[PDB]
Write a protein that binds this ligand. Structure first.
Ligand code: BMP
Ligand code: BMP
Lengths: 220, 220
């Protein structure tokens, strides 16, 4: 019933030029079937990059756009994003339920998925988001959200998120590697890990990906 | 000093195709020298839409990207956005001080401006954002933020935001027209109002803009 991510590993492709992004993704293609594409790449190379990734790799694409506007604008963003061929979109929960529902409506209309971001992995998340995160997660459950994002850098917060959403929901988690999160510990709670710089800034991205997978091989 | 916004009126250009967006913006050019371009237009037409607006109208451009990621990704978003020619970018404060600081550092390096969004005008903002809003504003002031966005639909919140940031800071305010905010009342606190649908969906956008301006004539 959930998305099936090869090797429980999602590449965060945040390189900002097309040649490098395509080359690095190609180098690791044997290890993944799911790529997270965000604004660094999209605002540098255009939304057409999504269709190009599908043409070259036949990977699923999660548009990490941290959608965080009013309902009317969220609807337009989701429509433009899914028109470009994204399979899923990541939406902030902090702006409230109506803004999430606007995204859920468009995803249902176009055959796509919404991922609800509940607590972020960066230190500043402790200031405002963390105190609201359990409530944001319960809001997700109330709204029928099935896909969530929570922080590798705080395994106790990631475990709590898993507790709230249940074992049947799908949970992906960034902050692995460069931000300090451990792949194996994160996969105790998340279905899949998101990895960016540890792979795409590596001297040998293929070896970097292979190494991460080796470290979690008994979890696959 | 602050940006000199003609008629205290900023167009929210959220049409999603180049031809309509260009037509409507040209139609109101005599009334407005400041245009807010967001993701509905950018994700539909590309970042080169900024260049096209600068070429056709010479209007100032505020990139309404509600930047809301970790510091490292925020930096990349700001760099790409200013590279494309945006005068300013709008940033969420709820992800915390580090994420805002990342944007400020890029804006300082590149000679551009950050606007901090503290609370939103839509109903769901009451769930989580509102209760953090005074503190998000105070954080902005502590970080040296000079430009702010606050909600016309909540006068008590907009007035408190103005108090916190002081009279010298620059404050712009959406939610006027379609969302119910009143132009004159909003300008008691905001330096400028942001107006989208009331203008861009009008049979005659020029007449719509002229009508808004006539209603606030004594405030100019
Ligand atoms: O809380 C979050 C949510 C994210 O989407 N991300 C995203 O996940 C990726 C993490 O990449 P990296 O492995 O290079 O730290 C980035 O694209 C970032 O924007 C994050 O780091 N923390
Ligand atoms: O709190 C906020 C912050 C915004 O940027 N906006 C933006 O301001 C514009 C409002 O447009 P309109 O006048 O059509 O309601 C939209 O682009 C929206 O994304 C808002 O409505 N409320």
């Amino acid at each position: 019933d959930v998305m099936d991510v090869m090797n429980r590993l999602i590449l965060a492709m945040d390189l900002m030029n097309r040649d490098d992004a395509l080359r690095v993704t190609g180098e690791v293609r044997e290890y993944i079937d799911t790529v997270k594409i965000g604004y660094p790449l999209v605002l540098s190379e255009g939304m057409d990059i999504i269709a190009e990734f599908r043409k070259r790799f036949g990977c699923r694409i999660i548009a990490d756009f941290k959608v965080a506007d009013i309902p009317e604008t969220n609807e337009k963003i989701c429509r433009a994003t899914f028109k470009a061929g994204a399979d899923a979109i990541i939406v902030h929960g902090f702006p409230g339920a109506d803004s999430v529902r606007a995204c859920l409506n468009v995803a249902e209309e176009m055959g796509r998925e919404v991922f609800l971001l509940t607590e972020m992995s960066s230190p500043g998340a402790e200031m405002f988001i963390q105190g609201a995160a359990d409530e944001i997660a319960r809001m997700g459950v109330d709204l029928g959200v099935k896909n969530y994002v929570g922080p590798s850098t705080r395994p106790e917060r990631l475990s709590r998120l898993r507790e709230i959403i249940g074992q049947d929901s799908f949970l992906i988690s960034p902050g692995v590697g460069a931000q300090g999160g451990d792949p194996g510990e994160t996969l105790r709670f998340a279905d899949a890990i998101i990895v960016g710089r540890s792979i795409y800034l590596a001297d040998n991205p293929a070896a970097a990906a292979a190494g991460i997978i080796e470290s979690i091989k008994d979890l696959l």
